[PDB]
Symmetry: D3
């Protein structure tokens, strides 16, 4: 299927400057060339225009920083993603902080009966204004997409929820807020923390994940946050957490997904050039995209 790249230079879902440079860092790491090589009809649709954050004092509220700007940008993203899907192309979204998942999922989900999601990350991203210890929307996209959160975020695209809890698989988690542990537990979301990765190995984790979703969804969205990988492998992220997934485990994960042919949409987020060591993180993301799209060693 042809691919359309949409850059979302988003940094409103958080407070550290630099993550808005993620889309072009990956471009500069050679994302187009890498995929053309695999014989893809790749198209770069450019970047979604992101506004300037409204003063904290007139925004949606403290627990939801930049609510309106984040919401607006996500609306635009959702429209772009929708069009791409309508054109029969695979939407490959580049971030940008994780709050963009709200827009991506909004543009995609409506096209599937039962959309599944693989959240490759160090965090669960299932906070709400109530549970968030930061007020940063980049830590709420999964919860919002499940229909839990401020309506300005849960209603992006004019519908909700985008996916069901039983259709989500979290992988690589190692940093959950108390509220989130409760949410995951209560909503019954399938999760493989680093404990399971270390205990079962990435091969079993991926095998179980693929089987689980293939068995109950009609499309699967890969929402990959680079902080899911260990900071030594992906140093350029806003909220790094040690003891993460290795460079090799991540390639095995992408290769298995490619092999399974279940990924129908994808986004690579949280790449921050300003916190990186010579674009290493954007490079990992591009290499991972290569594997996901079929690049093989033999």
């Amino acid at each position: 299927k042809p691919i359309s790249i949409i850059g979302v230079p988003m940094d409103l879902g958080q407070t550290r400057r630099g993550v808005d440079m993620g889309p072009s860092a990956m471009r500069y790491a050679g994302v187009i060339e890498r995929l053309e090589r695999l014989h893809y009809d790749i198209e770069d649709l450019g970047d979604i225009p992101i506004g300037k954050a409204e003063r904290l004092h007139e925004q949606g509220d403290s627990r939801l920083r930049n609510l309106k700007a984040v919401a607006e940008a996500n609306e635009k993203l959702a429209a772009a993603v929708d069009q791409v899907v309508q054109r029969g192309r695979f939407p490959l979204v580049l971030g940008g902080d994780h709050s963009i998942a709200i827009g991506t999922l909004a543009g995609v989900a409506k096209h599937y009966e039962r959309l599944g999601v693989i959240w490759y990350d160090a965090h669960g991203d299932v906070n709400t204004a109530e549970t968030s210890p930061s007020g940063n929307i980049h830590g709420m996209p999964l919860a919002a997409s499940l229909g839990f959160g401020h309506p300005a975020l849960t209603q992006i695209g004019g519908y909700s929820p985008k996916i069901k809890p039983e259709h989500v698989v979290l992988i690589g988690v190692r940093s959950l807020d108390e509220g989130e542990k409760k949410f995951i537990r209560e909503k019954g979301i399938k999760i493989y923390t680093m404990h399971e990765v270390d205990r079962l190995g990435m091969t079993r984790v991926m095998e179980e994940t693929i089987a689980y979703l293939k068995e109950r969804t009609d499309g699967v969205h890969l929402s990959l946050d680079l902080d899911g990988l260990d900071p030594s492998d992906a140093p350029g992220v806003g909220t790094p957490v040690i003891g993460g997934l290795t460079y090799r485990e991540s390639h095995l994960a992408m290769e298995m997904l490619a092999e399974a042919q279940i990924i129908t949409s994808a986004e690579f987020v949280e790449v921050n050039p300003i916190l990186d060591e010579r674009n290493k993180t954007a490079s990992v993301a591009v290499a991972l995209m290569g594997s996901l799209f079929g690049e093989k060693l033999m």
Copy 2:
């Protein structure tokens, strides 16, 4: 069960300065806070007073450096640990070179019919004056606790041996003196060298270890030497050996032990701030303690 912390600023069992700073580096790495967060009744009993070593030429055996001072301090530790166990609390001992295991085991062992020991280390620590290539008592604690060595060491606490060979499991070993290989072989001590860890995986090694001990002991003491981990993960150790256990394997190990609920006492040793990179090693110890005491990702 409530926890009591006992610091043993010991460096007499070896020759490199700095390991005596281990207890406070771990305190500064936040050991109390980490455990309080887990809802424990944690108490810090302070540090055992360590004497000064007498003139080497006045010492009566070069194969046992600082014997008197090491024995003396270990007696004190044994008393302290005994007191804690008597009070119904779990003794968490912080080192300090590994020779302190002699005191810890002396204070604990007497309270169990068949105490088991998990020696997580790169070394066997089973030397004697006869086999030691260094004369450093920090390389003799396991042998001494098994009743093999100078009576000044084997009789701490007024009894011997503290544990039986068939109740010991060595994990992470990769540096054994010839005499030690003979000792382990002949005494029939269960050992998983890096070869087994690589070949079987930490999960299998830990499963077998837990099953083995749970099946024949009434308490299990964890004697964790930070040099068991790779020097890249735990740089601050006096006798580093490459090709060690990773940060993740160690967390998995602690997590499985916690899960099994078999650990009845523990000690974290060989942390040396002076050979470290910004307290990294002390921090690893604290994070591993978190996992040992039940800290979970989900």
Copy 3:
């Protein structure tokens, strides 16, 4: 005097991706805040729109890569800078590869009888299509501004030359192409290579430079290329050259310039986040700007 910031996300004057991210890396390194603290009326005019380069095979000269797009963008910059000077504000230009000096000098020069230029760099940037070993316009801005090169470059702003050779002082030079050595020699441009910096000391070099220019110009433009500093201090540059100016020498230089009160415009260029170590280079630029604008230790 109030300051106006103009970002020029330019990478057309060279071939390595990333230098276009320079303006925002410096913004993220806190340029506005640093200057506001000094009590300045600082204004950020945004970024000059940079077009896309036309097909190389369609371009009419390989010795002048991206000539049209580079000229076009420089025209825009010149207009913007002119506007700022007309408004009685100091133009602070952020790059972006060094080819932007053509636009900056074009907008400024017209306002002075004898504009002086301090070129703090590892290179002379005095190549022409004839002498350039690369065809990269970023290595030609000083020559072009002196009226030497392709008219598309020498005529930006509708006039030429912008400055006279006798009013230029090169500092920190350590990498000159043969043609450039000839140019500097023949045009009689004052130059302090690393040999002079080492031999005389930065203090003497700066004293002589300030006296020289103050004695014959009515305004002085500081064109600071971060690659003038040693790669260990400023790693994020496209063409690093070892044996450069230290962090301290650069602060002393800026401090002496501020003290002299001769700088009437300035530009900080060649910052590339993608070749950097956690925005270090952009940070150095911001700290140097602080000193240039009067920041003092006591």
Copy 4:
């Protein structure tokens, strides 16, 4: 003159754990051996007992954290230093955060008509409860010794002030709070910030400093804070500030002082093993002490 070493494991004048390990890190870096080699009658008097900080809520006040504990410890230090001086020995104090300077100066000053002070540091340490942005007493010792501050600190030793402003020379300063700049300016304290070091060179700075003091004091106290050196040379400090004095400049400074024979008392502070890279900082301090006490290359 014979030397007496007094360790002051102080961390109450600040908030980061670890600086209390400074005295023994330097001991472990071999301070005694280094000085014995120079044929000194060196004596180690041990460490001053430091209490536990009183709860913020019952202490002297917010702007003066741990006031009573700091004061008390300084009283003890002053008594110890006084005795040493009375015994005709040179007092060499090892810290420990800089607040210990209050005790050292109290024990020394009373023995001189006009005691001079060389404050080798990145900071001025002339804050008061009024000007302090932290409430940390380690940033007030110089001001307190000049008689400016809370009486609990200004009256240590039963007298004040300990020295006169005109008898103080600050060297290496590069991080002053606004209040401090005012204090220095108004009290007329001689200061050589990094600007002067870069501009005049360490040789001239030291020459001027030595002449200045030799010309008006009857004894000179060297209060050396390791953060005075660049963080790359002395990484183990609580409040590092970039762009500092090099390893060589510091040795030249010590060698010139030794040569001048004007230093009558000294203290090396802020060494923190826990923030260091393999005791590098304590090692620098010991090497510097070697130079100060006469160690020469030829």
Copy 5:
């Protein structure tokens, strides 16, 4: 069986200087000492004399650089290896770029009915003048040994092919040229790329490899290219490729081979001191050789 060491200071099969220093870096890393310790009758036969590259204008070597010189050196190597085998000694060949495999296999193969080969590498080394993107013979030894390539290479030793495709097992591959992918695919060579290593694990991979070869060969040659290990573990190699085999995986591999007792000859290649970090790579090689030759942890 007694061991004979033959150094082959070869760098003709490639273009980066330094790999000719491989043999002595390993000797300096203690290869003799390490093997003597295991009680071997080790003999060092010295180095094969290698020639100088003749003028390109003279002889042609665009697709086959240094053909004559590489061929002549390999003839010498083949003779030396043959003699050692004839003397009933195990030939341990130290390189030197991988083109030396042509000579090693030529001297060994003729002595076995069905010689097997384990090619531990990041590359396939199965290029031909036709498929090679570099013209570097160090990327053609496996193809040449299989009887595919220039006769000057395929006929070394006076016979061809040296081994059969079905008796070859590639391990650690992660960088194959298109032509090589086709070759491996068509020739039916057994291969475990990093995908298989990650998916099955090194234990499984080695078990399958040993059973596969033991089941159909009468001897097995280990051709170990240090670049098979990740660049972080073996930095000193001419063509590093990230995402490689770890230091522990490699030890496990060597330990299992020793255990299986199937290796009848071996070579360690591509060690380049000039691209290394303090002989780290030569050190890993010596360590791996120790394991291969029976060194055990217990």
Copy 6:
């Protein structure tokens, strides 16, 4: 004057393996290319054949390790150097441990009435069997050349002494053995330790050195030991000593010597690839050679 390169792969004058690799690491760092570029008639005469160390039990060398082998190699070197000088060519000797200076000076000195020597080093290299704390001849070449030491060393070339103490200038010294301090002091050798470099600066030091020698010699030999530079700049050396000469200071030194046109012969020694970081040290050497031979920035 035409240049002849003579490699001396010597490691007999010391005990750490690797320094014998110095000559080719420099060749690989591009020494020929660098000098040809300066339009020199450069010739590479190859390497002096060096022997193997004979059994300690056989010949004695505790205070004079490898005496016979070091002496014999130096005789060969002396002949080679003599011939080159006889042919009217400048002898450029590449080491190899510093003991080779004995052979270089032996081949050169006889051709001058008053040969001067600039010993750029961290050490004095003026030990004798009596004063040497190591028995390593690489720490005795200067003393031996001055006619002090074992006759096997002092008589190389059939004459002694090669030079006079008053014609020697040591630069960069920071590590002298007590006996050496006495020797230098008593022999009246001119020396600039790091204290003088720091105090006077490299410009002053070189000016004084050039005027001193130019005023009383008819030729000057540059004996440059890379360990004279700081270990951060030249990491690959057998006996590094911190607080050394910077990369820039060394270039200035070479630039001033070239300018003075007083150097008539030279040798670059102690380069050890095996203790280096990617040939960095050999690279610095080649760079310094370029400056020495006239390479200029302008």
